[PDB]
């Protein structure tokens, strides 16, 4: 077979050309450009609220855009909308499949999604004329587990999956309008851009791919990790993103440079990152770990600012609110803690 | 405390109702036995779920035997890698592992140089020595038993195991497959492997599952009391 081998020779030529082009763009590291910048001090965040009521391991949380309600999914088959200011529970949504791996609050707040090992993104109408939360749609086109779902609108939702694909859905139609078919490992994380036109998706092939929601294409590809990318989060600019992997390093990539800018690693950390978020300015990089605690990274100097240590098991989910006020941090010890 | 509003009080009361329902659901799910049903592609898991309980995703099979509710989660339809979702079943009571032991000579459909029993052995090695099932006991099933005792009259076990020094009778080869599967245990002091042969039995496989699950529940009761 000459044609497939000469075209993979062309592919290796393209990889060498892209590598040397983004090496020609690499002149000065971000850690040496922000060396003049006064570092943030010892970040001391206390557990302000602790959210009790999940019986099994919490696998995902998602903040509402009102920065007060958050949904959390745990594998006792329960989707709980929490009120964070009052600690009390707004809804408990029993799930048709107990094996939920992801949850997403709609930015309107009218809907919430969940999904996992049933390969179905169930979408739950929070605001019904009845007082129950009912399923508004069940998105049943993925063949692997759903690892991340993310609401774009009330009617659009992009879902990561373990079938090496992401998929943009239409909720009133129930079918995937777009499929993102570029990854070769299980896609484990999503992060929508703030303008919601792009999203990055990290996968188990150690690569993050930047997609275009409208065009349906893989815009850029980001290979900087050694192990499976479990977590991804856009910078609040929308022009950068951080990836959390099982390599125990967080790497911040840039969309405009198409390369890794930083490596948020520590030699005393051997266990992978499950969750990555940013603060409201992107100065802080909240990263959840399997060593039972979140770590607060200076996202411009790669120096670990603080440690959110309150969890008796692996930190599995964390989100910073849209006003940057709090960091919820859910974990496998069946509690979410609100940090500030 | 009277620092709350009239609607804050009723929201707190709604949350305590939600708490009551959550506690009752957690207590209901605590009585149920979760079983992670595993095995190879042609290992006879569906025979097990149709003689024990009498699209995409994972399949749960609820059944009741001697006033225990069991829940058997078949994960055979997850072509994705097990590393990213096998921790979901950390805390499962036992692992039903079905092995078609008549597939000692047969090879796979995706790779025809590896035989199916050695693939089941590598899957059993990955599952048993996993970091999530260090104390989760394995109820191992050697399923197609009469087909095995016919096929060893038609084809020896040296096709599968070259280091085998026994003959082609049923009890020798069956005890050899059972010990070669139980030697894949690298814990051996934290988790127990329960082994059975399930060819044509009437309500005996679910009795074996109930007895092995009862031993697991006794050991977890003793660990809940520190003993």
């Amino acid at each position: 077979q000459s044609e497939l081998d000469q075209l993979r020779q062309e592919a290796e030529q393209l990889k060498n050309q892209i590598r040397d082009a983004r090496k020609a763009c690499a002149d000065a590291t971000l850690s040496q450009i922000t060396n003049n910048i006064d570092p943030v001090g010892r970040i001391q965040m206390r557990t302000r609220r602790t959210l009790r009521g999940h019986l099994a391991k919490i696998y995902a949380m998602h903040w509402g855009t009102d920065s007060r309600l958050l949904v959390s999914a745990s594998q006792d088959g329960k989707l709980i909308i929490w009120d964070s200011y009052t600690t009390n529970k707004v809804h408990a949504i029993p799930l048709r499949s107990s094996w939920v791996m992801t949850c997403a609050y709609a930015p309107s707040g009218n809907y919430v999604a969940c999904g996992g090992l049933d390969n179905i993104c169930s979408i739950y109408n929070l605001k019904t004329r009845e007082g129950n939360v009912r399923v508004s749609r069940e998105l049943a086109g993925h063949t692997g587990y759903l690892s991340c779902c993310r609401f774009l609108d009330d009617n659009q939702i992009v879902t990561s999956s373990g079938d090496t694909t992401c998929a943009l859905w239409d909720i009133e139609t129930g079918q995937q309008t777009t499929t993102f078919t570029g990854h070769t490992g299980d896609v484990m994380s999503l992060s929508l851009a703030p303008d919601t036109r792009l999203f990055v998706s990290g996968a188990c092939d150690a690569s993050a791919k930047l997609w275009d929601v409208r065009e349906g294409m893989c815009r850029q590809t980001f290979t900087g990790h050694e192990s499976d990318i479990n977590a991804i989060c856009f910078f609040p600019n929308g022009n950068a993103f951080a990836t959390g992997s099982d390599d125990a390093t967080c790497r911040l990539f840039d969309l405009r440079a198409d390369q890794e800018l930083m490596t948020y690693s520590h030699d005393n950390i051997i266990c992978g990152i499950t969750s990555v978020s940013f603060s409201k300015s992107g100065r802080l990089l909240l990263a959840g770990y399997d060593d039972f605690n979140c770590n607060v990274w200076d996202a411009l100097k790669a120096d670990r600012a603080g440690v959110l240590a309150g969890h008796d098991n692996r930190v599995s989910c964390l989100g910073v609110t849209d006003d940057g006020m709090a960091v919820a941090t859910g974990s496998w010890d069946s509690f979410l803690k609100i940090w500030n | 405390g009277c620092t709350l509003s009239a609607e804050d009080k009723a929201a707190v009361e709604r949350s305590k109702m939600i708490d009551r329902n959550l506690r009752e659901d957690g207590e209901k799910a605590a009585r149920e036995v979760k079983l992670l049903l595993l095995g190879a592609g042609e290992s006879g898991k569906n025979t097990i779920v149709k003689q024990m309980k009498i699209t995409t995703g994972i399949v749960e099979t609820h059944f009741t035997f001697k006033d225990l509710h069991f829940k058997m989660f078949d994960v055979g339809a997850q072509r994705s890698e097990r590393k990213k979702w096998i921790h979901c079943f950390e805390g499962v009571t036992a692992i039903i592992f079905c092995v078609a032991l008549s597939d000692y000579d047969l090879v796979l459909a995706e790779d025809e140089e590896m035989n199916r029993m050695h693939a089941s052995m590598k899957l059993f090695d990955s599952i048993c020595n996993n970091k999530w099932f260090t104390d989760t006991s394995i109820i191992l099933f050697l399923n197609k038993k009469d087909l095995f005792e016919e096929k060893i009259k038609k084809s020896p076990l040296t096709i599968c195991y070259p280091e085998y020094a026994g003959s082609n009778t049923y009890e020798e080869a069956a005890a050899y497959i059972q010990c070669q599967f139980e030697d894949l245990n690298k814990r051996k002091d934290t988790k127990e492997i329960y082994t059975h042969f399930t060819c044509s039995t009437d309500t005996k496989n679910v009795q074996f599952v109930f007895d092995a699950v009862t031993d697991v529940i006794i050991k977890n009761n003793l660990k809940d009391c520190g003993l």
Partner: single-chain antibody
Amino acid sequence: VQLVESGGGLVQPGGSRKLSCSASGFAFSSFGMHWVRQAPEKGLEWVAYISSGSGTIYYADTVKGRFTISRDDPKNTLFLQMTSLRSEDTAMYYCVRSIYYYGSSPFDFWGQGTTLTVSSSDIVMTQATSSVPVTPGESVSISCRSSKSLLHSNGNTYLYWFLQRPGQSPQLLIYRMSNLASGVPDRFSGSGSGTAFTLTISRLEAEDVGVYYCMQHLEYPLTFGAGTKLEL
């Protein structure tokens, strides 16, 4: 969603009457249910309240002791046992759906109540106006004054605006002083600070006329305002 109250009719005084409300079309066990009176050609008046799961029962001090409110969450039925029926208890008794979580709209569905006829501290909500004639298209500002700051410490102001059209049960317009209810068109708006409140209707129509009640939900009993009637 339907709340169909049952019972009522002529009741001679001193006798009991059980007012049933068969609920239908919603998750009845999740809703805290109210009973709200409306004496003939008078304003709304809250009678009783039972919580979701019957854990908290409040009554008006007019009916505290004589009336008992109860639920049957399997049958989806609300009761009001009215012992020792005085002659000021003649009214139309509406049964009100209400749910309380963060961002909920309580008092949002009212039943078409039963007319019960009998033979013979509290936050005072003062709507100083009582009848405003407006043509369709005028921008009305119905006001309401509270005898206590309805602004609670947490940030929201528990003021509830209702519209009782003639021959109709009351309908929630504005919940918690600024938030429009679910079926309510973006022509009603609420504003105010603590005690002085206003509901600004813009581009009024023929169905927007009717009686307009403000109601506090800061403190039990839930006192209504005397309604501002709108005509053409």
